[PDB]
């Protein structure tokens, strides 16, 4: 019969209040013989009714995919509320339930440090700026780079790694054209994490 | 049966002994049968094949059925950069040194911190991460007492990789 996957919001969406975090319950392998699907949603076991369910969409393998999207409150997600999606379909012997929530554990604040390039690399046409993010918990985080209020997306970020004290660390580095750096343009590392004051901090660097 | 490669430093340093390890035995180098596999007795089992550094590095295939070999692809030399602590972090009694290693292929590498001939405690090194151009990158972070940093002690990031000259480079830093 059908199967169910339940997807959490992305951390940046739960962390910036102007953004729109959603939980998404997806049902696949819905047959033609029994195409009707019903969703019941619960937040800490209490039924909610504000989900937006899309009509069924036939896939190229001749089964339907049915999607329901629950809008969450940012504070609810961050306070560890459990979101349950129950899926009924007449081909099932019983409804399928799936539950998700934010990673448990005592939040710890990242400290963020930016590191300017080496001289060695400055004899190439690109250069590396490093953002060192340390001491955070849980691992959920967003790290992004920007310049002049706009994204600088030519970066890589290490996945979070466990230190010996139980908290996480990572590095992000941004590859910029060397002329841009020499010209004195300011680059900024933006870190979004539930344990930061206002869930956001930015650290900036430029040449001297 | 699950077959394991040698570790990076073992293939790159000629004084070390690289081994392929077949855990749970026949053994083959590029199809041909070999008979130097020291097996050791089952424990409520593992077989070890000592390999030649150059055979591993030339891409020979080791068969135990699972086969293993070095990752295929043109080797690319790592670039190594070191960063002193942020002046912001200097307000704490621990500070961080960063060694940034980028543009290498294959992923097999050893990136280690040392001072005065000896390994440094309290470091963390990421497993290598795939970049857009097909190469790999990683960072290694050493945490030291501000005391040692400010006193002018010299810290070194040693990197061992097949595409380096002598399979080795060392980049050091200290206060100004
Ligand atoms: C018929 O066709 C069906 C549809 O497929 C089309 O695909 C083509 C390639 C082609 O084949 C077409 O013909 C075909 O029609 C097909 O359906 C598929 O069924 C699979 C199961 O058989 C499903 O596999 C699962 O996928 C999960 C990951 O899925 C995401 O990733 C894929 C890969 O890119 C993507 O295609 C999916 O759509 C899905 O995308 C996510 O979508 C959500 C929601 O929209 C996004 O989240 C939202 O994003 C918005 C902004 O857009 C906003 O940010 C919201 O807030 C946010 O919620 C995600 O961003 C997006 N993610 C991406 C892109 O990465 C796997 O996780 C899952 O793995 C689990 O289950 C396995 C068993 O099935 C198990 O072995 C595995 O270990 C794992 O187990 C889980 O472990 C977790 C933690 O470790 C636990 O949390 C779980 O409890 C645990 N689960 C267990 C044990 O069960 C799984 O592999 C596939 O998704 C589905 N495809 C689609 C499109 O729905 C069908 O199978 C076909 N049938 C036949 C018979 O062929």
Author numbering:
A (entry chain A): 237 to 444
B (entry chain B): 240 to 263, 275 to 294, 302 to 321, 333 to 444
Could you pull the original sentences from the published paper?
We then derived a new pair of IgG1 CH3 domains having TCR Ca-Cb-based substitutions as follows (BEAT): a first CH3 domain based on TCR Ca having substitutions S20K, T22V, K26T, K79Y, F85.1S, Y86V, K88W, and T90N (BEAT CH3 (A)), and a second CH3 domain based on TCR Cb having substitutions Q3E, Y5A, L7F, S20T, T22V, K26T, T81D, V84L, D84.2E, F85.1A, Y86S, K88R, and T90R (BEAT CH3 (B)). The resulting CH3 heterodimer was then used to create an Fc-like protein made of two Fc-like chains, each chain including one of the two engineered CH3 domains (Fc-like chain as follows: IgG1 hinge-IgG1 CH2-engineered IgG1 CH3 domain). To further characterize this fragment, the BEAT Fc was crystallized and its 3D structure solved at high resolution. Analysis of the engineered CH3 domains revealed the successful importation of key heterodimeric contacts found in the TCR Ca-Cb crystal structure with 85% of the imported TCR residues maintaining their original side chain orientation in the BEAT Fc structure. The four key sets of substitutions used in our engineering strategy were found to have the expected functions we described above and can be summarized as follows: the first set of grafted residues recreated a pair of TCR Ca-Cb hydrophobic contacts on one side of the interface (Trp 88 in (A) with Ala 85.1 and Leu 24 in (B)), whereas the second set maintained the existing network of electrostatic interactions at the opposite side thereby creating asymmetry. The third and fourth sets removed the Lys 26/Glu 13 pair of symmetric electrostatic contacts. Supporting positions 3, 7, 22, 79, 84, and 90 further contributed to break symmetry and add asymmetric contacts. Q3E in (B) created a new ionic interaction with Lys 16 in (A). V84L in (B) created a new asymmetric hydrophobic contact with K79Y in (A), a contact directly imported from the TCR Ca-Cb interface.
